[PDB]
Design a protein around this nucleic acid. Sequence first.
DNA 1: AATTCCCACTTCCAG
DNA 2: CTGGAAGTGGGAATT
Lengths: 162, 168
Amino acid sequence: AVPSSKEELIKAINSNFSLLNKKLESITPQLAFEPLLTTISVANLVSYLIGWGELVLHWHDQEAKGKTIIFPEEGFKWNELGRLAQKFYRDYEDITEYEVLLARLKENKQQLVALIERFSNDELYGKPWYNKWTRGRMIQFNTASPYKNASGRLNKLQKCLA
Amino acid sequence: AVPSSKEELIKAINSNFSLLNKKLESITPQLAFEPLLEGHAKGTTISVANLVSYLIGWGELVLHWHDQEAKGKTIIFPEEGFKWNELGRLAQKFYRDYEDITEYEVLLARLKENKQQLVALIERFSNDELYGKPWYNKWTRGRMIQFNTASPYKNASGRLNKLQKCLA
DNA sequence: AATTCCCACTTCCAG
DNA sequence: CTGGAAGTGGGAATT
């Protein structure tokens, strides 16, 4: 089902992260930076996940400080999401130890979950936030959804052996 | 069931519009612009005003289809820039298309004027042209019109019934 | 979502 | 067996 309450949103994020997390440590630090996925790496993909997660936190930073949010990101438009994926790859290009990469994804995920707990259910799925899209729906678009999508491309990859 | 003739199509439109319009008129203008409703697309919140905008967008789109046909120009289905799996994305366009209409009475007039043009248009087609042969893919012209006039009218009545149970 | 896409989940021969 | 085409069936589509 599509998440439609605060409780549902949290549980989707936890579950999709769990499974994706398990598939991610299943990769060795050596394979993770090779190009196996117009082809990228697990490292590239996890940076894409951190870029989006960081960005969602950034939106709420901006919002908290009374500042107008620039969606999706400054210098980008919603039809350019692959170009925003290029920026994310580079943003974390110099994190060369897989172990730190996964640790940074995991703590980002934790912050997002903490951010959601901070809002009421009306704040997440009752009111409109970005045009008609609710705050919770927006958060799911760029967290729980790409977790699933990412874990997909992963289990396909593990089917390369041997 | 589904209208099968020019006569049925025109009556189902006038009925479902008359019904829907009764519920729409029994909603305060102040309330009608409040965001309250889960929208056509999951994870959105919309007003009763957006609900009407959705109908106006679909009806004018239907008139636009025919305007294209009347000039001998190729129709783009469902609309320029949207594939058929992007109807959620189109509903949003329809909200924005009419959001500068801030007076509820003007907006229901726009829906009323739109519905009159739609039946006036059905009036100029024979039954054969409406239900006699396919017009787009396998559907008949009448089906395509009913599916975006009569049906969404009734659908909007449904949501208004459910909301009428609470009145704050 | 009329359709469209994208998964997960099969068959079922080729190997 | 055994990937792995290739075809199905259900659910979501979004920003």
